[PDB]
Structure formats: structure tokens, C-alpha cells
Ligand binder design. Structure first.
Ligand SMILES: [Cu+2]
Ligand SMILES: [Mg+2]
Length: 105
């Protein structure tokens, strides 16, 4: 299954919508640039399973995304450990633009 997360709330707020998603290994999370771009996707190395900067870097899309509707996807392959993965948008981190993916094995 693919789960879609909007970057920017439809109403014009600095949020991932929905904030929290639960997936199964093999599933895909697709981020779609929605409102008030740019945004990016940075995983917090302290809040991914195994507390790994390498894992967080692999998952991240650090470059800013400006075009309405453009997308970035991660498919949660077996390489990636089950557990919770917290991420944020760098330019809007203080605004509370944070989200979480729970990979349930
Ligand atoms: Cu943002
Ligand atoms: Mg469930």
C-alpha cells in the first residue's frame, strides 16, 4: 500500500498531513508538495530505529522541494528496521512541521 502525506496543510499551515502514518514493510510513503513550499524531509537520527545517522541520511530528501505537486517517496524495504521514524521540515521545524512513520513488522 502507498500512503500519501501532504507537505503543507490544505488550509495553508506548516504541517505534514497526516502527521503520523503506520506502515508495513514493503509499503511506500509518498510525500506530495501541497501548500506553502518549499519544504524538505529530514529524518531525526536520534528518533529512527538504531539511532543511525546513516539510516536517517538514506531516508531524507534534504533538498528543498518548490513545485506544487512534486513528490518524494520511500518504500520501506526489509533493509529498514521496524520501529518509529520521526522527521521534520528544516525551514519549518520551529513552526512544528514534524511527522512520524511507524513501521510495524
Ligand atoms: Cu516545510
Ligand atoms: Mg493499525
Amino acid at each position: 500500500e502507498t500512503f500519501t502525506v501532504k507537505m503543507g496543510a490544505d488550509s495553508g499551515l506548516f504541517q505534514f498531513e497526516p502527521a503520523n502514518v503506520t506502515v508495513h514493510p514493503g509499503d511506500t510513503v509518498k510525500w506530495v508538495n501541497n501548500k506553502l513550499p518549499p519544504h524538505n524531509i529530514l529524518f531525526d537520527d536520534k528518533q529512527v530505529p538504531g539511532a543511525s545517522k546513516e539510516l536517517a541520511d538514506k531516508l531524507s530528501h534534504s533538498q528543498l522541494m518548490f513545485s506544487p505537486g512534486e513528490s518524494y517517496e520511500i518504500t520501506f524495504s526489509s533493509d529498514f528496521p521496524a520501529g518509529t521514524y520521526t522527521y521534520y521540515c528544516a525551514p519549518h521545524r520551529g513552526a512544528g512541521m514534524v511527522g512520524k512513520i511507524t513501521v510495524e513488522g
